[PDB]
């Protein structure tokens, strides 16, 4: 056991091993501290989670977001530094801190962007997103306050940003279709990509309706292909009964945009999610062509989320979370 130093920021009570120092404040899923890691010598971000066992959703959201921290091992994705808890023992295990890089900033604070600029930014996340994909995660809620940005332009994607959310997701989401994929958070890129080439957010919608509103004005309303396809009675007569809506020519609506931009935005903001572009298959499109390569664009391990069906109690969660804590192996420094 590393040994313990408390003090007191915002309110909020931190008990951090003495390896972490200077802790200040940077904004409040739980709190951040940035701090000076005088082990690796790194500026290190430290989150303490608010709450972490006030209920079951809490609990198993606790441990979810252990677990998937602890799964991602990439460039583009945000990584686990350290955990640790003040704990001595189970019994007393009440407190969650997760350590990972600080990052500059995030890509909500960063406003137009050259092309070039943003070929480098959208290959980062896709290339992220490749990762988390083929481990069969799916985001669910990208935008640019959950991308992180640092000085050098490298970019990773984070758990949460800690604008309204409803603008970056996908509208078979906005619609609560159950089998949804992957590509929802493609979408979500489709999103972020032309709000940095044009500085103005793509669907700004004031609540769920006028959210499907602007969309459709922008992709058209379902077309014959899309409309057989779905099962809900009535979502497929709220669609059969809307005033018919052309797709826009993606052209018309971004000029001055590289057309490989334009394309690939035209890829990924198919109104069907059956026929947008994967993670994997954005990669080669030729908008990448300086920053492509088959060979570093790599895979995740398998990750067990059988977690996720499981209904359990408040102490179960708990205590899986403290194995996790315990058996946790920080990552070998540069
Ligand atoms: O499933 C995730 C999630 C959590 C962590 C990570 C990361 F960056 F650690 F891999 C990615 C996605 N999210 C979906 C929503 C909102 C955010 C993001 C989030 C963060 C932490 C826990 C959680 O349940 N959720 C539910
Ligand atoms: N194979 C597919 C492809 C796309 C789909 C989609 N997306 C459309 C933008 C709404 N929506 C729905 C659906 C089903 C029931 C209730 C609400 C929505 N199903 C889809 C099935």
Redesign the pocket.
């Given at each position: 056991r590393p040994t313990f130093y408390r003090q007191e920021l915002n309110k909020t009570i931190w008990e951090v091993p003495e390896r972490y120092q200077n802790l200040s404040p940077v904004g409040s899923?739980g709190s951040v501290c940035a701090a000076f890691d005088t082990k690796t010598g790194l500026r290190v971000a430290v989150k303490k989670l608010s709450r972490p066992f006030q209920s079951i959703i809490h609990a198993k959201?606790t441990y979810?977001?252990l677990r998937?921290?602890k799964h991602?091992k990439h460039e583009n994705?945000?990584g686990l530094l350290d955990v640790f808890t003040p704990a001595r023992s189970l019994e007393e295990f009440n407190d969650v801190y997760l350590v990972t890089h600080l990052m500059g900033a995030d890509l909500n604070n960063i406003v137009k962007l050259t092309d070039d600029h943003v070929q480098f930014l959208i290959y980062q996340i896709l290339r992220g997103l490749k990762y988390?994909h083929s481990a069969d995660?799916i985001?669910?809620?990208l935008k640019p306050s959950?991308l992180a940005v640092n000085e050098d332009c490298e970019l990773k994607?984070?758990?949460?940003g800690l604008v309204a959310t409803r603008w970056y997701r996908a509208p078979e989401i906005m619609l609560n279709w159950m089998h949804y994929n992957q590509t929802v958070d493609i979408w979500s890129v489709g999103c972020i990509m032309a709000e940095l080439l044009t500085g103005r957010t793509l669907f700004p919608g004031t609540d769920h309706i006028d959210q499907l509103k602007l969309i459709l004005r922008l992709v058209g309303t379902p077309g014959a292909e899309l409309l057989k396809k779905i099962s809900s009675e009535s979502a497929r007569n709220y669609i059969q009964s809307l005033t018919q809506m052309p797709k826009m020519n993606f052209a018309n609506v971004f000029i001055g945009a590289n057309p490989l931009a334009v394309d690939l935005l035209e890829k990924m903001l198919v109104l069907d999610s059956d026929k947008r572009i994967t993670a994997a298959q954005a990669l080669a499109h030729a908008y990448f062509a300086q920053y492509h390569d088959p060979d570093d664009e790599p895979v995740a391990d398998p990750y067990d989320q059988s977690f996720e069906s499981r209904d359990l109690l408040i102490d179960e969660w708990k205590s899986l979370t403290y194995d996790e804590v315990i058996s946790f192996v920080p990552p070998p420094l540069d």
């Open positions: 899923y959201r979810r977001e998937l921290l991602m994705v945000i988390i995660i985001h669910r809620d959950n994607i984070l758990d949460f």
